[PDB]
Nucleic acid binder design. Structure first.
Ligand code: A1CHB
Ligand code: ZN
Lengths: 766, 459, 746
DNA sequence: TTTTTT
């Protein structure tokens, strides 16, 4: 009663067959039981073992009981001799699509056609290429062919049939192990892949990082799990030489044993703060105890009486030209005694340097020449004022009427106390409290405090630019801000380990401005720490940003609204970059406080009347009897993604020199640049004949000097493109094959070309 | 041999979703009756047309040009019941080539042939009647009625002519490079499906099954354009349109009815990009990431002068892309150097057709002097072409001529992504260093899709 | 029948330098003697000399100079209104001129000696000094003095200074000012000059807004100080009777000016005005207006001085600061004047011998030596040190160490070799300049004023005659050889030094001190006696008997470079550090930090494996660096403290165009330029010449990220030497300034 | 500017 499923192609030629007998046990069959039954079925000597034979999206009948019929069936099944019409009647594509190998031609044709759907299992849903790959890793011992007939020496079906029937991958252990090995390999592979995809999907769903970080992450993680070496070792592990399952040579796979050791090992690093700080930030602090702490404070923080209420302003407030001239006039009274001559970036740099300069004893400070008072005490804040229609009016002040600016949002102690009695809460109470809320003339309309790298930063001021899918309710925003407070305080207690930040009493301050919910979050730097450096606060911002997208409450609250999960901008901390102060507008939205009371705040009225003190929202404010002071002056430099650092490590390990080293090939600033200019002169005549005789006699002069970008202005320059004022430049970077990327660039001072933007014209090899 | 592994083991969840999407029986009342398509024939203008829902399902397969989505289509064909179609004849033949390279695939035709598009429909007024959608929120019935009013001059003719097709034997319709089809077609296909299963009373119609449209294509490397010709001004205009992919991804009504969250597969990896840098450029381009200084310096190494690309003596054997058909007509010429009908129609007009007289591509990109690829079933040089046509087929060596001011970063991404290797790529200017109109709306939608637990990413 | 008087000569100045008729190669020079008799009464006297061309070319060292050139220079200097500041053209010319006129004065007339009794004669028929003889009777009057303060605002145009500094880059800015007055003498006519000469009899003060104009404030009179004397003379050069006006300095003798803010232009202008005022009336000869000083040369000079080569004939001594011991330096200047006849430090090395007679004396001294030293002189290459010393990375202790020095060995050896070549000199009477050097050497231990003279006369003499260096360093090499030979006998072991100064160890048990003094004294005795015996055998005889100085006993000694040595006696905690550059006020604090860190790190002799000690030493060195940079912050605004003294030889920062506006402050710059590197704006570090701007200074914050790096560099040099010298080598102590504690300043 | 369906 042995049942055979046979594929034929015209006397009948049978070239693939699956023999099976109905299992008399309910659930008796095991893998080794099936292997024994199959090895018994396919006779090792040749043919089958039964007495009577019934021979018959799906990929694809005669009885045999008399002696002649069964003899003919054995002859046609073990050798390949065609079955004549009498026996039945009384009762290149294949070589192409089923592998060139004999193993494939027999075993894969048997499985994919006559064995896949009948036996069920996962292999029923796998394609021909997948099944051929599985056959390729089914690397059972290979004995030589007795007739040495090659698999490609086959023309008709009388050859393919003879090859398959007299093969030793067809009538024994291999023919019995292949169906079981398909199931085993798939099971082992899915065990590892499904685990890796569980990790992938979870980390993807809870990442809450910037758009650019996400891309690197998905790609790199997919590479670790699926990469040439990882996939190769995994398939080598599943490789079996013994078809017998008991002694199969397949062991657990190295994949899912190296990723969980390499990157997925630290996939749970960005997944949890405490591991994001340990592995991504390198803290560099320097303790300073004694009079040196007091010294460092005054030297690197706004003077005590500079952010304290004063009746009228006192400082230099003027437009760009009027302050450019006044700065030069001040230098004319400053040069006689030491200040070198400086023969809108230069003005801001000079003003910041003037403000930073400290007082030497009772002598009036250096900025007193510009501010024109002897009561001025440095260091000082420097602000930028945008006016109408335009004009960046820089203003350096020694004191200002901040009481007047914050008067509108100042709530009397009686009011706050009465609201506290009406609403004894911290979430519903802040709700009620918030609901209850010429260069000289423009000073009190628009200010933008300008970062001074010389001074020490005392407040973590984060600019939260929230993007919105649709309008939001205030209560959801206030709850999200409470969650943000929680996450930021966890991140702060992680960054500053010797501080004491109780995340129910530590005051965080919040200010809010169809487009965006403009937010500003101000945090006191906990004592005894002071943060120094633009890059250090950049790192603090990255830690806070990747810590707030870890708290499930924040993402659950605001997640359905934020189109891009990036909230914190980290580019407002460079030297000379301005940030819009709270209690100020933009020339369209006056930043006003939104009160998120600490859950265990012991002084609510103080917290409310703490948002009106300028010190709470100034980068280099005076810190509010210091014994010890710890200056976090580095939290690690360039914050190469904790991922792309591995993508920088994997960049070479898989793909494969800096500009300076490449310059070594050319024996290496203006000298070699003029040699490259000689090559440019020859080609510029042909490429642009209208200005051919212009750059023939120009001199290279380095204007921009970067590690991988040396730009040299070609001071003698009519624009080559959009021929009509323009400046020509010579770029220097890395070429295609680690060469010299020398580019001709014609920045144009006209409207047609992007004004003051650098453009490229041709890049030639060197 | 390990290259296929990720696809092999990640297409299985896709296969284990399309099956239930295709074996879901509809309620008896929701099945579009024959009388519906009888009334549609009776209707003359697409105004009194009744609001009628035509149920359908989708499964979206998206990714880069060489992402390997073709492996997903291959696995689908050999395992599932399916009618594989294509948005263009070239794409249909490309799929046939890649499906017959593994097993048997029946002759793959275009979706247009499948729903009965014939010769007279080619030049048909496909944008005439108006529609004020009683919407916001837009009901699916209103969207389908808009897409039927859009194609009234095609839907009506198909219904009238109908009142054996391959739509009678399967409910899984794979449309490859479906971004080359406009949104009007999506509803149309579903509509036509029900037609061909109602007149013939197919066993699927008795089983109350509904169409599932497996749309495979690149959403940020492909666009669909609609051309209308004004018959007095003789000004043929071509506006941009919403493709099927963008319609499905960006419409809140379709993203809910079709449940794109549980029905979306993004193929994420290229397999011909041997340049960390070329790959990184393609990544910044297909995702909308901020353009940094480093990217500008990288693409700086490709810029070669305007008079270097256009000169035929340079870059021999390099395909040159322009952003204007007149520009190609100029460059090809330079390279070579190196009664009753018009009586009655004039009567009816109350008072450029060379392009609208044959295959547009070669008709407006020819100087006929030759020096090639067959266009129709009409030869093209394959040496110079437009960026918009370049979307269809990949190229070996590419020199891009960019017109300033008309710079669209999607055009730059399409032009730069036609070649496998960044080594063989030259350009007029730097698209990253010049003013470019970037439209990063579908980019954030893919990004939010890459940020969803129910979307299947295949590496 | 010659007149005879009794007087002491207080000064000798140059009045006239003329070329007589029928003369081609010999010029006569008239010398003004400011003689004073007993009880101070002063009578002016005059003498004549006759210098030949050969003598001029000998005292110049080259034949480029000629008699015509000297006479032209003297004629130009005759008038100060037309052209003052004559020496600035060829300072060597006037230097040699004074040298030869003094030599001829010594030769023809006889032996002269300032502030000393001298019998003087005169010939009435002609009316000049004829012969000077040393007398031996009289308690001569004390060399009285007068305190002079003079300040002038000579409105020099800055751009001229900038241009003249551009022609010669490393031109000391006092030379720039002085050249500006020389090229525009009218600038010396308009200046707010104020003068106050206080004497013991009567004070005199004048104030001017314009120099030529009458005073806007008077006090006393010109006549109280000066007794204008008209004296008739009949020189052999001038047959006709020639009358000379001289400014006899009644009441006082020499001037005493504070060197703190001394302005050579100020005194030049005041003396030019006096010259114009006195010699305005004709009928008499005009004197020479010549002055020399370190401000008169492009590259400057070490020791402040103001020579008076002519008018008014009164020596003026600049005594720089030193308020605590002002009388001591005034006496030192007076002694230096009296001994070296006032040529020092203006004439230079020619006080001893002509610059060109030295090539003969050195050769004549290479012959009288012993045969071995004869070759030893000829094989001397710069810094040979042919003696068994220690490897520069090395340290010793605990063993009884000791430093020794021969006080003034180069000067004494030069004197002995000069006597060896004395027989080879052309003129036995031309050896009087060889009597001043012996007077200096003999009086060197008794009085320190001879010291500073000998520490500059000798190195400059060695530059006048390059061949004398190979002789002096060969004689000293021979001395070191016998030092090493005798050392073994007395348990001494040569371990390092530089010749005259040498430090070594003792092979005595390192715990006993009662017998330590005995061996340390016997070694000194034996080494001194043996070196004296070698010198005597080498024929070289020293005027002052040789003496060895025990400059300290120490137990530990560590050396890193060839000059850097630190010694420490644990018992009394007395230490000594050498080789650390004191290039400013911060380097002294660095030296103190180093001498405390080394005292603490060699106190770690507690029994430990050598590996442990290296780490517990490096930790302490890093901690010392930390405590230094912490204290550096509390003085970040003291730019003068963070200042470096650049020499006119070293590469220097470029002068800002506003430092050329210091007024009466550019004159103070003679040798050193004190520069502080400040950081204006960002990125750029610019140098500020501190002493060329008025005080209090206003500056951008001082770039301590540059000065502290160099101070730390030399600290790590010392610390790497000690770390790799006491314990196992292989450790270059580096302090991560750029990371650990860079934030404080940058 | 702008392809594509028979
Ligand atoms: C070292 C490394 N190597 C990696 N691999 C194999 C790739 O980047 C391969 C590739 C290259 C081009 C495309 C691509 C193509 C497009 F048409 C559009 C967008 C695209 F991204 C996708 C994949 S990934 C990494 S990492 C930095 N993730 O560690
Ligand atoms: Zn331009």
């Amino acid at each position: 009663p042995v049942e055979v499923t046979a594929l034929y192609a015209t006397p009948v030629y049978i070239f693939s067959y699956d023999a099976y007998t109905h299992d008399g046990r309910a659930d008796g069959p095991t893998e080794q039981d099936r292997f024994e039954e199959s090895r018994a079925l396919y006779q090792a000597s040749g043919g089958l073992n039964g007495d009577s034979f019934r021979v018959t999206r799906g990929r694809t009948v005669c009885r045999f009981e008399r002696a002649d019929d069964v003899a003919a069936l054995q002859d046609a099944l073990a050798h390949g001799t065609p079955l004549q019409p009498d026996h039945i009647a009384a009762t290149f594509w294949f070589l192409s699509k089923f592998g060139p190998d004999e193993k494939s031609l027999v075993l894969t044709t048997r499985y994919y056609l006559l064995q896949a759907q009948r036996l069920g299992g996962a292999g029923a849903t796998y394609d021909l290429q997948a099944i051929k790959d599985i056959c390729a890793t089914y690397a059972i011992p290979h004995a030589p062919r007795p007739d040495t007939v090659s698999a490609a020496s086959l023309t008709s079906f009388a050859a393919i049939t003879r090859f398959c029937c007299t093969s030793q991958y067809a009538r024994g252990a291999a023919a019995a192990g292949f169906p079981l090995y398909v199931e085993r390999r798939i099971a082992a592979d899915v065990r590892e892949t499904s685990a890796l995809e569980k990790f992938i999907t979870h980390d993807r769903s809870c990442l809450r990082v910037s758009d650019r970080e996400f891309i690197t992450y998905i790609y790199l993680a997919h590479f670790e799990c699926f990469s040439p070496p990882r996939l190769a070792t995994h398939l080598r592990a599943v490789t079996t030489h013994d078809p017998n399952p008991a002694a199969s040579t397949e062991q657990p796979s190295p994949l899912g044993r190296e990723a969980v050791e390499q990157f997925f090992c630290h996939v749970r690093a960005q997944l949890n703060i405490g591991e994001y700080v340990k592995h991504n930030v390198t803290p560099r602090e320097t303790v300073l105890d004694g009079d040196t702490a007091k010294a460092y404070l005054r030297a690197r923080t706004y003077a005590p009486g500079a952010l304290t209420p004063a009746p009228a302003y006192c400082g230099a407030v003027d437009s760009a030209t009027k302050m450019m001239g006044r700065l030069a006039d001040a230098e004319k009274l400053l040069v006689p005694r030491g200040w070198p001559a400086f023969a809108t970036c230069g003005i801001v740099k000079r003003l910041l340097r003037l403000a930073a300069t400290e007082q030497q004893g009772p002598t009036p400070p250096a900025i007193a020449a510009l501010i024109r008072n002897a009561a001025v005490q440095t260091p000082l804040p420097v602000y930028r004022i945008s006016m109408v229609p335009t004009g960046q009016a820089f203003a350096a002040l020694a004191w200002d009427d901040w009481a007047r600016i914050t008067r509108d949002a100042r709530l009397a102690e009686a009011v706050v106390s009465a609201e506290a009695a009406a609403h004894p809460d911290h979430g519903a109470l802040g709700r009620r409290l918030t609901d209850r809320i010429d260069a000289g003339g423009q000073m009190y309309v628009n200010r933008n405090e300008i970062f001074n790298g010389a001074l020490a930063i005392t407040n973590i001021i984060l600019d939260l630019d929230i993007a919105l899918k649709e309008p939001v309710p205030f209560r959801r925003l206030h709850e999200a801000l409470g969650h943000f407070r929680r996450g930021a305080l966890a991140a702060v207690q992680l960054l500053f380990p010797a501080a004491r930040v109780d995340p129910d009493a530590y005051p965080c301050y919040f200010f809010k401005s169809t487009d965006k919910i403009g937010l500003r979050v101000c945090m006191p730097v906990p004592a005894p720490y002071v943060v120094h450096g633009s890059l250090t606060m950049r790192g603090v911002a990255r830690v806070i940003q990747q810590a707030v997208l870890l708290d499930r409450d924040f993402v659950e609250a605001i997640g359905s609204y934020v189109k891009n999960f990036l909230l914190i901008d980290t580019g407002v901390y460079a030297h000379g970059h301005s940030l819009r102060l709270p209690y100020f507008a933009k020339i369209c939205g006056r930043l006003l406080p939104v009160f998120v009371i600490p859950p265990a705040c012991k002084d609510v009225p103080a917290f409310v009347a703490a948002h009106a003190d300028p010190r709470r929202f100034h980068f280099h404010a005076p810190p509010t009897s210091p014994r010890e002071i710890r200056v976090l002056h580095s939290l690690g430099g360039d914050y190469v993604s904790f991922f792309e650092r591995k993508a920088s490590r994997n960049a070479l390990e898989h793909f494969g020199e800096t500009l300076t080293e490449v310059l070594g090939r050319y024996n290496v600033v203006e000298g070699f640049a003029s040699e490259l200019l000689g090559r440019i002169v020859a080609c510029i005549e042909t490429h642009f004949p209208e200005h051919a005789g212009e750059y023939q006699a120009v001199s290279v002069r380095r204007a921009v000097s970067k590690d991988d970008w040396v730009l040299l202005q070609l001071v003698p320059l009519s624009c080559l493109r959009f021929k009509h004022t323009a400046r020509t430049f010579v770029a220097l970077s890395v070429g295609a094959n680690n060469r010299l990327c020398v580019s001709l660039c014609q920045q144009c001072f006209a409207a047609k070309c992007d004004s003051n933007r650098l453009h490229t014209l041709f890049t030639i090899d060197a | 041999a390990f290259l296929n592994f990720t696809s092999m083991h990640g297409v299985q969840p896709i296969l284990k979703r399309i099956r239930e999407l295709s074996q879901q029986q509809l309620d008896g009342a929701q099945v579009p009756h024959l009388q519906w398509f009888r009334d549609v024939a009776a209707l003359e203008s697409p105004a009194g047309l009744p609001l009628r829902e035509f149920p359908f399902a989708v499964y979206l397969i998206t990714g880069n040009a060489g992402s390997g989505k073709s492996t997903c289509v291959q696995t689908i064909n050999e395992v599932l019941d399916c009618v594989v179609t294509g948005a263009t004849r070239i794409a249909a033949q490309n799929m046939y080539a890649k499906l017959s390279g593994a097993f048997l695939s029946r002759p793959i035709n275009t979706i247009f042939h499948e729903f009965g598009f014939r010769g007279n429909h080619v030049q048909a007024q496909l944008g005439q009647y108006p529609y004020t959608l009683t919407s916001n929120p837009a009901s699916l019935e209103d969207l389908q009625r808009r897409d039927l009013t859009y194609y009234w001059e095609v839907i009506l003719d198909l219904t009238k002519r109908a009142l054996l097709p391959a739509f009678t034997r399967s409910n899984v319709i794979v449309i490859d490079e479906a971004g080359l089809l406009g949104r009007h077609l999506l509803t149309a296909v579903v509509y036509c499906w029900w037609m061909i299963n109602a007149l013939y009373h197919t066993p699927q119609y008795a089983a109350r099954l509904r169409p599932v449209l497996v749309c495979v294509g690149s959403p940020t490397q492909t666009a669909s354009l609609e051309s209308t010709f004004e018959h007095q001004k003789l000004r043929c205009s071509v506006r941009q349109s919403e493709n099927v992919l963008t319609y499905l991804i960006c419409n809140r009504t379709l993203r809910e009815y079709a449940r794109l969250s549980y029905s979306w597969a993004i193929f994420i990896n290229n397999k011909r990009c041997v340049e960390h840098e070329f790959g990184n450029l393609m990544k910044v381009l297909e995702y909308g990431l901020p353009i940094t200084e480093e990217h500008m310096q990288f693409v700086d190494r490709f810029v070669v002068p305007e008079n270097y690309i256009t000169n035929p003596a340079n870059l021999p054997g390099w395909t040159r892309l322009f952003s204007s058909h007149k520009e190609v007509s100029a460059y090809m010429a330079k390279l070579h150097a190196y009664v009753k009908e018009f009586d009655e129609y004039r009567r009816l007009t109350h008072q450029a057709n060379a392009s609208r007289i044959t295959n547009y591509s070669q008709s407006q990109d020819q100087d006929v002097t030759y020096v090639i690829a067959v266009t129709a079933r009409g030869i093209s040089s394959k040496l110079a072409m437009t960026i918009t046509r370049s979307q269809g087929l990949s190229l070996d060596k590419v020199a891009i001529c960019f017109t300033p001011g008309n710079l669209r970063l999607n055009s730059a991404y399409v032009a730069m992504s036609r070649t496998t290797s960044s080594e063989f790529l030259r350009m007029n200017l730097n698209p990253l260093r010049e003013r470019h109109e970037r439209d990063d709306v579908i980019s954030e939608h893919i990004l939010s899709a890459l940020r969803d637990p129910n979307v299947v990413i295949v590496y | 029948d010659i007149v005879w008087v009794e007087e002491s000569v207080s000064a000798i100045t140059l009045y006239a330098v003329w070329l007589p008729p029928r003369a081609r190669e010999y010029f006569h020079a008239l010398v003004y003697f400011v003689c004073r008799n007993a009880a101070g009464e002063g009578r002016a006297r005059f003498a004549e000399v006759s210098v030949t061309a050969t003598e001029l070319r000998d005292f110049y060292g080259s034949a480029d100079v000629s008699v015509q050139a000297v006479v032209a220079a003297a004629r130009a200097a005759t008038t100060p209104a037309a052209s003052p500041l004559e020496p600035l053209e060829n300072p060597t010319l006037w230097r040699a001129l004074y040298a030869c006129v003094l030599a001829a004065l010594e030769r023809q007339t006889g032996p002269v000696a300032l502030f000393a009794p001298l019998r003087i004669g005169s010939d009435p028929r002609t009316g000049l000094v004829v012969k000077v003889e040393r007398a031996s009777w009289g308690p001569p009057a004390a060399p009285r003095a007068a305190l002079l303060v003079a300040e002038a605002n000579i409105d020099i145009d800055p751009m001229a200074l900038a241009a003249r500094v551009a022609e010669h880059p490393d031109a000391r800015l006092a030379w720039a000012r002085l050249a500006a007055i020389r090229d525009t003498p009218q600038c010396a006519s308009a200046a707010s000059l104020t003068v106050n000469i206080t004497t013991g009899t009567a004070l005199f003060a004048r104030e001017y807004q314009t120099l030529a104009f009458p005073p806007i404030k008077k006090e006393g009179a010109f006549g109280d100080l000066v007794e204008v004397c008209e004296v008739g003379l009949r020189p052999r050069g001038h047959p006709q009777r020639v009358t000379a006006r001289v400014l006899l300095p009644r009441d006082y003798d020499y001037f005493v000016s504070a060197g703190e803010k001394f302005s050579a232009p100020a005194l030049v202008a005041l003396f030019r005005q006096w010259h114009t005022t006195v010699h305005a009336a004709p009928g008499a000869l005009a004197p020479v207006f010549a002055f020399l000083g370190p401000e008169f040369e492009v590259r400057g000079g070490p020791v402040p001085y103001f020579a008076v080569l002519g008018f008014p004939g009164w020596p003026t001594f600049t005594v720089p600061a030193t308020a605590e011991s002002a009388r001591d330096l005034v006496r030192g200047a007076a002694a230096a004047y009296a001994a070296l006849l006032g040529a020092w430090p203006a004439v230079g090395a020619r006080v001893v011998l002509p610059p060109r007679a030295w090539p003969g004396v050195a050769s004549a001294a290479a012959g009288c030596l012993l045969p071995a030293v004869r070759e030893a002189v000829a094989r001397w290459h710069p810094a040979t040190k042919i003696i068994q010393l220690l490897d520069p990375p090395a340290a010793v202790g605990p063993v009884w160490t000791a430093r020794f020095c021969f006080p003034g060995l180069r000067a004494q050896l030069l004197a002995a070799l000069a006597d060896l070549g004395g027989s080879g000199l052309a003129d036995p009477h031309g050896r009087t300049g060889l009597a001043r050097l012996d007077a200096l050497v003999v009086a060197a231990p008794s009085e320190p004023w001879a010291g500073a003279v000998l520490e500059r006369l000798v190195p400059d003499t060695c530059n006048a005659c390059p061949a004398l260096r190979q002789l002096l360093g060969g004689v000293m090499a021979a001395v070191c050889l016998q030092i090493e030979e005798t050392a073994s006998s007395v348990k001494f072991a040569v371990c390092g030094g530089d010749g005259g100064a040498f430090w070594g160890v003792f092979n005595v048990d390192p715990q006993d001190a009662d017998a330590a003094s005995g061996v340390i004294e016997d070694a000194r005795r034996a080494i001194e006696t043996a070196v004296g015996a070698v010198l005597r055998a080498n024929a070289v005889r020293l005027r002052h008997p040789l003496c060895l100085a025990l400059e300290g006993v120490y137990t530990h000694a560590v050396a890193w470079s060839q000059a850097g040595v630190w010694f420490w006696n644990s018992r009394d905690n007395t230490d000594h550090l050498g080789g650390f550059p004191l290039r400013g006020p911060a380097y002294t604090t660095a030296a103190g930090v180093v001498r405390d860190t080394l005292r603490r790190v060699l106190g770690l002799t507690t029994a430990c494996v050598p590996e442990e000690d290296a780490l517990t030493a490096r930790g302490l060195m890093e901690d010392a660096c930390d405590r230094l940079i912490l204290d550096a912050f509390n003085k970040r605004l003291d730019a003068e403290y963070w200042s470096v003294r650049v020499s006119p030889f070293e590469a220097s920062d470029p002068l800002p165009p506003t430092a050329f506006r210091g007024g009466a402050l550019l004159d103070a710059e003679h040798y050193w330029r004190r520069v502080v590197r400040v950081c204006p704006g960002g990125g750029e570090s610019v140098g500020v010449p501190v002493d060329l701007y008025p005080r209090p200074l206003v500056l951008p914050p001082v770039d301590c990220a540059h000065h502290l790096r160099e101070i730390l560099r030399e600290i790590e040099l010392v610390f790497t030497g000690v770390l790799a010298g006491v314990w196992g080598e292989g450790g270059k102590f580096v302090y991560p300034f750029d990371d650990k504690m860079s934030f404080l300043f940058a």
